[PDB]
Design a protein around this ligand. Structure first.
Ligand code: ATP
Ligand code: GDP
Length: 1813
């Protein structure tokens, strides 16, 4: 057995190459076994290539391969060269199967070469029906290991769609292999429609995962070609809402519509298709089996037809008699707006006889057809942007009465349509705005006009008989016309709007309308507003009269006659004062008297108008300072009411003495106050500010004892960083010389005066000489020569007192100070004696008394102490008065309190400010003469009981920390990386003198902004007056401070590299340098028109033509360059060369922002001028236009937004980028505009207020989900939206299964966070937001979301009910008492979101779910399907139920009883939900059934009980009851079949008793007492109880009936004989016995049989023909996979409860397992086993069945239990039978919705890539 034959034989078969191999292969094959020999592979591989094509050796070679990659290259090339020659593929696939199981990666090599080319042919060469089961098993075992790698699956699928092969592509889809992965721009469907594939190949790709964007691209592709079966399949997945009967073809750019496409979109009753793709499912099952083996041991015609944006240049293609010309006749909605049609085809407009919302606007019509009106039942005919000819006369041969809303907006009309009165009788909303109507109108004999309109026409006037024949007009509104009077308006008008006309007085035809409700006459030029005794109408609510010329506001005559008025707009008028009689209009809500410039006072009466929630105060001055951080137009009412209580004059002023390093300040203050003592013989230099107070009872006729508090500020320069905090605008400043250095010190005093002009422009100053004893008195020259009136504040006197002892000059100084104080008069208001409520004075008195009762070590007071001291006294202040009270007392120098939220010490109140000011200056004077270990100025924590904490918890909040004062005045030498005059940008800030606390606060605002260029911090070396922070030679910034020679001013040089990151630096630094100047120093950037516009702040820009070595930088004032905005480049008088403005000031042009949002004005196809393109927003500011070839909405800004604010909003708006957020596209200048995405379907509120019929209980869910996603993104980005209303939800499409539906407008947060409606709209407002007491939170956005959900659910019921009653529309919901959605409004109960509402409607803020949860609770797919739960009365046990489908109008679900051992039928309606009880049997009833008789029109209802007493009772009559034959054993199942075997309609009844005896009856024989059983079929035994029944899935088998009996299922037919006796206990796969060795419980008839037994946690799947257990599907095989982490106690529940308590099978989609536990299972019976388990809604799913209710057919009822162990210790449980009603369409949603999230999650990331780059 051992010789050297092996080597000789191998080598001789090698050399013997022409024709020897036939025997050599046989020899080596024979020898490969015996010694188990081990260099032949290469040669036996070589012989194949050296001599192919010989079958007899090919088979042998394949047989010997099984005993480098080129191997594979020969293998398939062999099997492909012999595709189907013989069973040599067997040997081949054996070879592959052998090779893969030892070399896994080689599989990837096989698919590398060609393996698909042969394996697909093998699996598709009709191997099925060729009984080669062993061979196919071999191929499947091979493939299972081939498709191990998922990437191999994806590439195999890619190459399997290249060659059209439906069966294998389906098999691969069932095996995973997602179909949206190829290229994302040319992914599967794109080429599959390019390569001219089959309809079945496209349908399978669409049905599974295929991204919608790719589907749209493929639709464009398949439009390119002419295909009629692939187009109709793309539309059927892109645009069809079967639940709503719609076609949402809106956004698509279909070039032309042809009926051969929409043919199959319309429903077709004939559509019925067989099951031939079962081959693919079987192969998938085999592959899955082999994979897990390799894994484990090793009517209703659709109505809405939307064709909006498809640029249909013609629609004639549907007018013909084509395939769909019979489905169109019941359309009832047709949208053709925004196309480019013309001449609607006459044949079409009579083809469809049921159309009622035909709207086709923005088309290019040129003649109103006048044959559109011959349709049968038409309404809302809408042609509203076409170019309708000059006249639109309606032909009088049409008598169409049904028209209701005949819109004709924005045409080119020249007349009212002529023959309305003879054609459109019942017309209601005749709208004719935007036309060019010129001549006087017709008498207009319309009998039913309800809302006319004539806006923007050119009307001369109205004929006196214009409205004399329209007795129901309600809303005549002729805006923007040239109108002079009104012609006897009918007495029925309610709302009348007449703005922008030319009146001179309200025509008396308006003053007498007996029901008028609102009257808007803005922009008129009227003179006299008649008093309320001229209006004759008890119901005036709105009186809009802005922009008129009104003198008086007459209310003295009779004010209560306007007691209901709720809106009164009087802005832009010549008003003088508000009469006190305004205090009677209690129902006032929104008063507006702004922009009057001549009002100057508010009467104390207005404090009684507590309903006011807004009150603009723009451009008018009052007797008090408003808008501190409060004064929200509501606290003002509290102030005006408390001042009504008791108004006293307030005498207290501020006299801020100011000096410089030494003067008569303290020795002049201690002489003004006449302080005799000055006990310190030599007082030393001042620390801090040293507030003192001194009363002055002026001993004169004016007994006003004024108390002005002196703050003798610090002289020495060291304290100069904090002073601008103690320089308010209400003061009387002094200043002092020390005239010893006369005419030289007076120069050095210049900065001080400048700062006084910087902080308080309108504050008086008094110079005071301080020296006559020390000698130069000609100083009055220079103060009159230089110092007086050139950029320095309003000097009003000057004196020369000695200031060491009393003097006549000192007395004159006293008199001057007193007379200057009492005559202050800012805005002509006389500050010194203004009126305040006495409550403030009382609080001031008690605080002053408290100042002697405070700990010296810590003079602070806690807010608790203050709220205790208000209780100690009898103060009339609430928690809403103090927020203004303490601020006002801060203004008077009593106590400093800081309301700044960032400064987290607002809880502290610093009574005795003379200690806070003294302590804040201790650090600035403590030095360290030890070791200068750190550079001069930087320091760490180096100093009592916890006071060290608060000291620097104030000081660095005070931005003293590193002390920016006494910090290296001399600048360290710095050199920029590039200084070549052309890579840098430079901007100046020339100002006459740096203000006091400028650099200290400037270097502290630039400093802490670390995330520049977005978190990489820069290196910075910052002296007193510079920073120079740099990241690289590519990004740096030097905010220097130099003085150029021969320039006594002081500049602020900024240098930033001209790179792209540089412009970001420059913009973000100029913002922080400009916002400061207008926040603290409003005097500087105050253009003084008196004199000239110096502005004291000449922000230059430096630009140079000569790139590098320009030898000089050319100045340009920033304002004048901003005037050069009409262009984009600058150029000198020499125009050949020029500089780009985007390079010398990239902040003015919006270039610092991410460059992708640059305007690109060239591609903007936009027309601001027209108002028909204003369509977005009623007379708003957001238009509609085209850009980049797509429709987008521009937002033209008015003159309000300063460009700096626009940039401040764009910076935050530009990096949100979420699929549920309105995203920017471009923004720019010329004009100052903004472009965003066009929300096609407009705001939500419109949709839910006039189009309720589209919200469909699954769009009302997608909208809420998308809005919750928006909030969850915002709240994660740490910004609260603060105002969310159905006015701010912008829809995109009404097709439910879309990727982007709802999108909240995010411009609100920009407009909010830029300029700080922050309190939110009244109705849509959280409880903490209306009261305004508490600082706000995310829990207010959550409450706003709750209200949004409530409005969506009721579909605009609350909004409509509140627009007539707003003052309750807010206050009823301000407490969470808004009513139950179901009782007040008709709505689908939807009771899983009602709990969401009542959780988001909790008053406690942090008790409301956070936004992430309220999105993750809507993400669940079992709230979009649950429809209503009915907790039955307390402790009722019910175990049986039957529905009613014969009366499908309103149905009642008849239940049984288990709580009584004796029988009782338990009726239960659904629309009333009223349970009733009626004992009818003497023994507990077990089941019921419905036998409806087509004759006599009744539905007898039958009931089988445990006693066998088979009861029958009539539907309506509960008295005509006759029990039939008393049965022998317990009846267990009743059933009503479909057995029409007698050539007529026929039915029977089955009585399943506990023994098997089939007591069958007939449909009609139920009436006679003791019915007659036709065929008494005793089937089972006494020990084998008949326990279940079922019926066939199809009707082609003549409804073969199947019933379970004992443990053996049986069946019969019209023969009524047992056709099979299948036995289940005799199973050959015992995992356990009693799961099959028990009585049957359920049976379902389908392609297979699914069966369960008592307490069987596994279901058995038999076949009808083979009678084999083809399936064994275990329940805990699914439950114990989700109950792994969420149930840790389940580890103790190994003896698990949980089993199949009932079956219920859907038609062909899935199967619903009802567990004996508290769970339910979805089973996709075709491919994948578990779809979802929906638990935690009951505890025991007892009964389940299918039914139909009220045209909402096919619902699934689930009678489960919820036991309460309230007294479980008493061995009793509290039972609630929680009957629920799921919508049977659940198994789709749960797999549809879980796709929908994924599609957005990807979009949630891809969008955030644009934020990166
Ligand atoms: N991108 C858009 N697409 C379609 N409609 C829009 C878009 N943006 C805004 N609108 C609509 O235009 C209307 C006016 O917008 P606007 O921002 O003026 O509303 P507003 O903020 O309530 O009014 P205001 O700014 O005067 O307070 C709104 O009804 C909004 O629905
Ligand atoms: N001899 C004399 N001394 C004066 C006169 N006016 C002010 N002084 C001196 O100025 C000092 C007051 O210091 P002061 O300016 O209040 O300190 P500062 O507030 O920190 O700048 C006193 O010590 C006086 O000696 C004056 O008219 N005559």
């Amino acid at each position: 057995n051992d010789i050297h034959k092996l080597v000789l034989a191998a080598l001789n078969r090698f050399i013997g190459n022409p024709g020897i191999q036939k025997c050599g292969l046989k020899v080596i094959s024979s020898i490969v076994h015996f010694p188990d020999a081990l260099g032949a592979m290469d040669s036996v591989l070589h012989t194949l290539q050296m001599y192919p094509d010989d079958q007899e050796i090919q088979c042998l070679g394949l047989s010997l391969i099984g005993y480098g990659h080129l191997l594979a290259k020969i293998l398939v090339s062999s099997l492909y060269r012999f595709k189907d020659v013989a069973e040599i593929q067997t040997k081949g696939f054996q070879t592959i199967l052998a090779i893969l199981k030892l070399s896994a990666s080689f599989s990837k090599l096989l698919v590398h070469h060609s393996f698909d080319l042969v394996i697909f042919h093998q699996m598709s060469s009709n191997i099925m029906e060729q009984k080669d089961q062993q061979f196919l098993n071999l191929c499947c075992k091979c493939f299972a290991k081939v498709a191990m790698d998922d990437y191999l699956k994806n590439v195999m699928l890619e190459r399997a769609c290249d060659q059209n092969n439906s069966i294998m592509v389906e098999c691969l889809l069932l095996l995973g292999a997602d179909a949206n992965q190829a290229k994302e721009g040319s992914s599967l469907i794109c080429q599959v429609c390019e390569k001219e594939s089959s309809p079945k190949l496209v349908e399978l790709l669409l049905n599974s995962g295929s991204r919608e964007q790719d589907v749209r691209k493929a639709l464009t592709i398949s439009i390119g070609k002419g295909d009629s079966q692939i187009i109709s399949l793309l539309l059927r997945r892109l645009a069809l809402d079967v639940a709503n009967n719609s076609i949402c073809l809106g956004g698509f750019c279909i070039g032309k519509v042809e009926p051969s496409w929409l043919g199959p979109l319309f429903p077709d009753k004939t559509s019925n298709l067989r099951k031939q793709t079962n081959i693919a499912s079987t192969l998938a099952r085999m592959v899955i089996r082999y994979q897990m083996k390799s894994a484990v041991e090793e009517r209703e015609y659709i109505t809405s037809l939307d064709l909006s944006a498809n640029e249909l240049r013609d629609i004639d293609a549907l007018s013909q008699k084509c395939c769909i010309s019979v489905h169109l006749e019941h359309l009832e909605k047709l949208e053709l707006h925004q196309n480019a049609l013309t001449s609607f085809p006459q044949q079409l407009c009579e083809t469809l006889k049921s159309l009622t919302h035909l709207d086709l606007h923005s088309n290019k019509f040129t003649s109103f057809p006048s044959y559109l009106l011959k349709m049968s039942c038409i309404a809302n005919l809408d042609v509203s942007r076409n170019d309708i000819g000059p006249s639109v006369v309606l032909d009088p041969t049409v008598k169409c009465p049904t028209l209701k809303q005949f819109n004709l907006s924005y045409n080119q009309l020249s007349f009212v349509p002529e023959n309305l009165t003879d054609v459109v009788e019942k017309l209601e909303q005749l709208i004719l705005e935007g036309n060019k109507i010129s001549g006087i109108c017709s008498p207009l004999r319309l009998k039913e006009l309800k809302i006319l309109n004539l806006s923007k026409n050119h009307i001369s006037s109205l004929s006196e008989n214009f409205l004399e024949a329209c007795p129901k007009v309600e809303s005549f509104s002729a805006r923007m016309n040239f109108l002079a009077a009104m012609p006897f308006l009918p007495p029925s008008m309610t709302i009348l709007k007449l703005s922008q006309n030319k009146f001179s007085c309200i025509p008396e035809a308006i003053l007498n309308l007996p029901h008028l409700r609102s009257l808007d006459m803005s922009s008129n030029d009227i003179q006299y507003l008649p008093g309320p005794a001229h209006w004759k109408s008890l119901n005036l609510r709105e009186l809009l009269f802005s922009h008129n010329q009104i003198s008086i506001l007459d209310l003295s005559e009779k004010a209560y006659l306007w007691s209901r008025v709720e809106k009164l707009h009087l802005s832009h008028n010549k008003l003088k004062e508000i009469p006190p009689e305004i205090g009677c209009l209690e129902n006032l809500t929104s008063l507006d008297v702004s922009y009057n410039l001549e009002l100057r006072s508010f009467p104390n009466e207005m404090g009684k108008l507590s309903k006011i929630w807004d009150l603009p105060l723009d451009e008018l001055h009052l007797n008090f300072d408003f808008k501190h951080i409060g004064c929200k137009a509501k606290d003002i009412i509290r102030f005006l009411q408390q001042r009504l209580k008791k108004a006293v004059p307030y005498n207290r002023m501020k006299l801020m003495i100011v000096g410089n390093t030494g003067s008569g300040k303290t020795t002049l203050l201690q002489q003004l106050m006449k302080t005799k003592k000055s006990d310190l013989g030599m007082q030393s230099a001042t620390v801090g500010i040293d507030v003192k107070d001194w009363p002055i009872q002026i001993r004169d006729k004016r007994k006003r004892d004024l108390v002005l508090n002196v703050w003798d500020f610090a002289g020495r320069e060291e304290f100069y960083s904090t002073h601008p905090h103690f320089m308010t605008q209400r003061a009387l400043y002094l200043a002092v010389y020390d005239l010893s250095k006369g005419q030289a010190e007076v120069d050095a005093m210049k900065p001080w005066l400048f700062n006084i002009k910087a902080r308080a422009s309108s504050s008086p100053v008094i110079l005071v000489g301080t020296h006559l004893d020390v000698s130069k008195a000609c100083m009055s020259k220079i103060t009159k020569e230089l110092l007086n009136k050139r950029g320095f504040p309003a000097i009003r006197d000057y004196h020369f007192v000695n200031a060491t002892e009393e003097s006549d000059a000192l007395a004159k100084l006293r008199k001057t100070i007193i007379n200057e104080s009492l005559n202050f008069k800012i805005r002509d208001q006389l500050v010194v004696g203004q009126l305040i409520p006495d409550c403030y004075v009382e609080l001031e008195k008690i605080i002053l008394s408290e100042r002697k009762n405070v700990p010296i070590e810590f003079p602070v007071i806690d807010r608790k102490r203050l709220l205790q001291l208000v209780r100690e006294n009898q103060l009339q202040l609430d928690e809403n008065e103090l927020p203004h009270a303490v601020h006002f007392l801060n203004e008077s120098g009593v106590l400093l309190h800081f309301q700044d939220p960032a400064l987290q010490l607002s809880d502290l109140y610093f009574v005795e400010p003379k200690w806070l000011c003294k302590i804040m200056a201790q650090i600035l004077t403590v030095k360290v003469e030890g070791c200068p270990k750190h550079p001069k100025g930087i320091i760490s924590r180096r100093d009592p009981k916890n006071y060290m904490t608060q000291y620097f918890k104030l000081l660095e909040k005070f931005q003293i920390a590193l002390v920016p004062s006494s910090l290296s005045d001399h600048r360290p030498v710095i050199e920029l990386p590039h200084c070549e005059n052309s890579e840098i940008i430079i901007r100046l800030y020339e100002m006459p003198y740096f203000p006091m606390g400028f650099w200290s606060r400037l270097i502290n605002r630039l400093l802490e902004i670390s995330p520049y260029m977005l978190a990489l911090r820069p290196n910075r070396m910052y002296w007193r007056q510079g920073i120079y922070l740099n990241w690289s030679p590519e990004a740096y910034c030097l905010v220097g401070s130099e003085v150029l020679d021969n320039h006594p001013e002081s500049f602020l040089k900024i240098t930033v590299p001209s790179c792209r990151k540089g412009c970001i630096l420059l913009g973000q630094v100029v913002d922080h340098i400009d916002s400061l100047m207008e926040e603290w120093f409003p005097g500087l950037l105050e253009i003084d028109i008196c004199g000239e516009g110096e502005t004291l702040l000449k922000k230059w820009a430096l630009y140079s033509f000569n790139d590098g070595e320009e030898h000089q930088k050319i100045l340009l004032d920033d304002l004048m360059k901003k005037a050069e905005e009409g262009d984009l480049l600058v150029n000198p008088d020499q125009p050949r060369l020029t500089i780009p403005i985007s390079q010398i000031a990239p902040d003015l042009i919006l270039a610092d922002l991410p460059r992708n949002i640059m305007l690109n004005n060239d591609e903007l196809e936009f027309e601001q001028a027209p108002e028909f393109l204003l369509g977005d927003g009623s007379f708003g500011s957001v238009y509609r236009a085209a850009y980049e070839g797509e429709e987008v909405a521009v937002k033209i800004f008015n003159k309000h937004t300063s460009l700096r604010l626009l940039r401040q909003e764009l910076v935050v708006l530009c990096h949100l980028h979420h699929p549920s957020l309105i995203s920017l596209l471009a923004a720019g200048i010329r004009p100052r505009m903004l472009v965003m995405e066009l929300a096609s379907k407009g705001s939500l509120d419109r949709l839910l207020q006039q189009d309720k019929a589209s919200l469909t209980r699954t769009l009302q869910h997608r909208i809420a989900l998308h809005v919750a996603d928006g909030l969850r993104y915002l709240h994660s980005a740490m910004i609260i939206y603060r105002d969310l209303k159905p006015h701010n939800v912008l829809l995109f499409t009404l097709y439910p299964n879309a990727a982007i539906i709802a999108k909240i407008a995010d411009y609100g947060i920009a407009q909010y966070c830029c300029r700080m409606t922050s309190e939110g709209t009244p109705g849509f407002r959280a409880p903490e937001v209306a009261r305004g007491n508490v600082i706000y939170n995310q829990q207010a956005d959550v409450y706003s979301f709750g209200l949004l959900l409530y409005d969506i659910l009721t579909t605009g019921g609350r909004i409509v009910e509140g627009l007539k009653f707003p003052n309750e529309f807010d206050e009823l919901e301000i407490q969470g008492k808004l009513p139950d959605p179901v009782k007040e409004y008709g709505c689908a109960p939807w009771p899983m979101v009602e709990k969401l509402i009542k959780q988001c409607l909790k008053e406690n803020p942090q008790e409301r779910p956070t936004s992430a949860q309220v999105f993750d609770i809507l993400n669940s797919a079992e709230l979009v399907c649950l429809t209503r739960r009915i907790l039955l009365p307390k402790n009722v046990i019910v175990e049986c139920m039957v529905a009613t489908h014969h009366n499908s109008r309103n149905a009642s679900i008849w239940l049984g009883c288990g709580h009584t051992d004796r029988g009782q039928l338990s009726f239960l309606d659904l629309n009333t939900e009223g349970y009733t009880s009626e004992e009818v049997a003497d023994s507990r009833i077990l089941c019921l059934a419905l036998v409806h008789l087509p004759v006599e029109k009744e539905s007898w209802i039958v009931s089988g009980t445990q006693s066998g007493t088979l009861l029958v009772i009539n539907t309506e009559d509960g008295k005509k009851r006759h029990t039939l034959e008393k049965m022998t054993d317990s009846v267990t199942c009743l059933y009503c079949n479909s057995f029409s075997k007698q050539s007529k309609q026929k039915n029977f009844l089955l009585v399943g008793t506990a023994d098997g005896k089939l007591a069958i009856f007939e449909d009609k024989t139920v009436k006679l007492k003791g019915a007659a059983p036709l065929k008494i079929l005793n089937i089972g035994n006494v020990s084998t109880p008949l326990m279940c029944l079922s019926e066939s899935t199809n009707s082609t088998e003549r409804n073969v009936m199947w019933g379970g009996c004992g443990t053996k299922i049986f069946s019969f037919s019209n023969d009524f004989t047992i056709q099979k006796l299948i036995e289940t206990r005799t199973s050959q796969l015992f995992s356990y016995a009693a799961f099959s060795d028990s009585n049957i419980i359920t049976v379902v008839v389908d392609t297979a049989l699914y069966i369960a037994k008592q307490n069987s946690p596994v279901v058995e799947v038999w076949d009808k023909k083979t009678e084999k257990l083809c399936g064994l599907i275990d329940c805990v095989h699914f439950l114990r996979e989700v109950t792994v982490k969420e149930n840790k106690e389940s580890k103790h529940k190994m003896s698990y409860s949980g089993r199949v308590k009932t079956l219920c099978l859907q038609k062909n989609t899935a199967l619903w397992i009802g567990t004996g536990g508290g769970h339910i299972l979805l089973l996709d019976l075709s491919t994948r086993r578990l779809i979802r388990v929906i638990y935690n809604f009951c505890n025991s799913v007892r009964v389940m069945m299918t039914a139909q209710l009220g045209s909402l057919k096919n619902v699934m009822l689930v009678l489960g239990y919820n036991r309460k162990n309230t007294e479980g210790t008493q061995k009793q449980k509290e039972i609630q039978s929680c009957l629920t009603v799921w919508d049977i369409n659940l198994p789709h949603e749960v797999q549809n919705l879980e796709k929908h999230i994924e599609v957005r999650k990807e979009l949630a990331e891809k969008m955030r890539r644009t934020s990166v780059e």
